[PDB]
Structure formats: C-alpha cells, structure tokens
Write a protein that binds this ligand. Structure first.
Ligand SMILES: C[S@@](=N)(=O)c1ccc(C(=O)Nc2cc(-c3ccc(F)cc3)ccc2N)cc1
Ligand SMILES: [Ca+2]
Ligand SMILES: [Ca+2]
Ligand SMILES: [Zn+2]
Length: 369
C-alpha cells in the first residue's frame, strides 16, 4: 500500500502546435489539462519536469532511419517536392504536415522516455506523460494522427532493466502499433480494450493472441458501441488481476486515451471520468513501477477533466467536484464541475457478451507458464 511518488512531465510549448483547421487533434488540450491540475494545487504533491527533446538517435531505437529522416525534413514549405515520400510514410491527410511537426514528436516522445528512465533508476513510483500514448505509429509509417511511437520507445527503455513489461490500453482504439512491435516476444504483454468492428484501425480481434515466442502474450477485448462504467467494471479488474497473476510483470505502462469517454467528438463509448479512472486505481494497487500516458480524446474539456482526475488518483489526493478557476474556465460550462454524466446512448454490450469474452480471454491466459 502507501501513497506513491509521482513524477510528471510537461512542456508548455506543446499547446502551440496546430494540426490545421478542422483537424480534431488539439495539442492545446495538454495545456488545458496542466492548467486545471495546477489550479487544483496538485503541483504541491508531485515533481514536475520538463522533458528533453528526444533525438533522432532515440527514435531509431524503433523507427527506421529513413522514416525519421523524412520526419526531420518535411515542412509545409517543401511539401510539393516530397509528394512521393509523404504517401510512402502515410503523411499528408489524417497525419498532416504542420509547422514544428518534428519538434512536436520530440516533445511527446521525450516525456515518455524520460519517465521510463526515471522508473528504471528507481527514483519514482509513477511517471506521467499526458502528451504521450501515440499507440498507432508504426516502424516506418504515421497513422491515426500519430507519427512517433513514444510507447514502444519507452517500453524498450524499461526492457533494459525489466524482464517482463505489461502494457494496458484503455483508449477506445486498438493499440495496434504497440501490439505489432511486440507481437513476437513474451517480454512484453499487450492488453487492449477497444471498440471493434468496422472501426479504426481494423485490428484487435479476440483471436489475435501473438505469434511465435509471443503467442498468448497479446490480449484483445473487442467491444461494441456505448459501453458504460458498469460494463467496463465487469471485466477490467478481473482481467488485469488474472494477467498480473499469470504474467507477473515488473513494470507497467498504462495508456489512458480519453476518447473512450462519454460525449467524445470521435468516439462511441459512454464511460464517465470516474469509470475511466477506476482503471488507474486498479492498476495502481499492484504496487508496480507505472508509466501513465495520454492518448486520444477529442472533446477537450472532458480530456482535461479526465487526466486531471487521474493525476489526483495517482497521487491519492481527493479533489472537489467544483472546478477551481483557471485559464480555460469557460470550456467547462455550463456546469463547471469536474465529473461528467453518461449519455442515454444504447449500450450494445450486453452483460452476457462481456462475461463471454472475458471467459474466452481467461482460457488463453491459462496457456501461460
Ligand atoms: C479519422 S479515424 N476515424 O480513422 C481516427 C479517429 C481517431 C484516432 C485516434 O484517436 N488516434 C489517436 C491519436 C493519439 C495521439 C495522441 C497524442 C498525439 F500528440 C498524437 C496522437 C493517441 C491515441 C489515438 N487512438 C485515429 C483515427
Ligand atoms: Ca485500447
Ligand atoms: Ca507480446
Ligand atoms: Zn484513440
């Protein structure tokens, strides 16, 4: 038990990067998150660090030299000359070229790798990088608004000191970039809960379980539209408890993508901030070194609420539902409260469905040594 030492990573420049008019990814939400939790006074309880800008050397621990060299070079002013290379690396539409793109990648990545180093040195119990969690980026390809996979890079850092690392992903989307990087090893177990069925990125079937040495070390829980706190609570603690029992990791990475929240502009789930944060509480109780990362989230007032509350959860610090004044106070109307209510959308996930999928995953976990 006991309260944990928390190190938190934030660069105030992050909020000034702009994906372009109408693009749903708003890096400003990270600044909103920071400003809200500062105004709750959570800076009194944790160490706040500014991450370094991760280097191309650091990024090619996973990504190919040619992809990182492209990301270093491409700019809005030289786009027309790179039209062939942009298609090769899936840059240009959902993953646009914008001013400062490579510096933006260096910032999100630097916080995750810095947090992993801090955990490796046993200088913190938990490290938090809300700017991170870019689980879709591939070895040589951007995808799903992500360019550089900070998670894979951070896990590679943890693996220097940890035989087994557990990755848990509560973003509404399948963590395909992370699962793919570690699909054939048993040194990382990936566990993703996600909407599945004609949904981005198209992977994460129940029956994708890993390959080779990694067979049974990939776990996927496919879900339907409208899942609520009750349905998620049916299955999250039982599955993570069984994973902990069988896999016995020595470090954990938790991707806390907030596009699984009720009312997300892009997502189709119905979780509240309390139900989302219950996952952090569950993982926290195993008392393992823990890297907590951001992810998706497109209704940015709810992103700020979610990650502020989950920072408080990490700190075992109770905070009031009445929002303190802050630089973005108008975003939180008309209620100006921290917690959110679910919508009346139908939950397509029946209780029988939840239990059945869980039972099938339990069968797979029995195949571990
Ligand atoms: C058009 S779509 N329907 O195909 C569609 C819709 C939403 C996403 C999506 O949520 N992506 C995502 C991005 C990040 C991320 C975080 C931080 C950051 F700086 C850059 C990216 C993290 C996690 C997810 N999952 C991808 C595709
Ligand atoms: Ca997920
Ligand atoms: Ca694996
Ligand atoms: Zn997502």
């Amino acid at each position: 038990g006991g309260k944990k030492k928390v190190c938190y990573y934030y660069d105030g420049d992050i909020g000034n990067y702009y994906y372009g008019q109408g693009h749903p990814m708003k890096p400003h939400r990270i600044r909103m998150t920071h400003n809200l939790l500062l105004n709750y006074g959570l800076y009194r309880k944790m160490e706040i660090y500014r991450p370094h800008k991760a280097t191309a050397e650091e990024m090619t621990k996973y990504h190919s030299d040619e992809y990182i060299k492209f990301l270093r070079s491409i700019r809005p002013d030289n786009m027309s000359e790179y039209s062939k290379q942009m298609q090769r690396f899936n840059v240009g539409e959902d993953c646009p070229v914008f001013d400062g793109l490579f510096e933006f990648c260096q910032l999100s990545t630097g916080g995750s790798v810095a947090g992993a180093v801090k955990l490796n040195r046993q200088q913190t119990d938990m490290a938090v990088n809300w700017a991170g969690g870019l689980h879709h980026a591939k070895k040589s390809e951007a995808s799903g608004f992500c360019y550089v996979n900070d998670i894979v890079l951070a896990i590679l850092e943890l693996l220097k000191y940890h035989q087994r690392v557990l990755y848990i992903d509560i973003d509404i989307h399948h963590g395909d970039g992370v699962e793919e990087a570690f699909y054939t090893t048993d040194r990382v177990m990936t566990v993703s809960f996600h909407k599945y069925g004609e949904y981005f990125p198209g992977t994460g079937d129940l029956r994708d379980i890993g390959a080779g040495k990694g067979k049974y070390y990939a776990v996927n829980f496919p879900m339907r539209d409208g899942i609520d706190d009750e349905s998620y609570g049916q299955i999250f603690k039982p599955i993570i408890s069984k994973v902990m029992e069988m896999y016995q990791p020595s470090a954990v990475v938790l991707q806390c993508g907030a596009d699984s929240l009720s009312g997300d502009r892009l997502g189709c789930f119905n979780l509240t901030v309390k139900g989302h944060a219950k996952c952090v509480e569950v993982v926290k109780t195993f008392n393992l070194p823990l890297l907590m990362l951001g992810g998706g989230g497109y209704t940015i007032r709810n992103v700020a609420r979610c990650w502020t509350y989950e920072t408080a959860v990490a700190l075992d610090c109770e905070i009031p539902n009445e929002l303190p004044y802050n630089d973005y106070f108008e975003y939180f109307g008309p209620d100006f409260k921290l917690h959110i209510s679910p919508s009346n959308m139908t939950n397509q996930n029946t209780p029988e469905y939840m239990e059945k999928i869980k039972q099938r995953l339990f069968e797979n976990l029995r195949m571990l040594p």
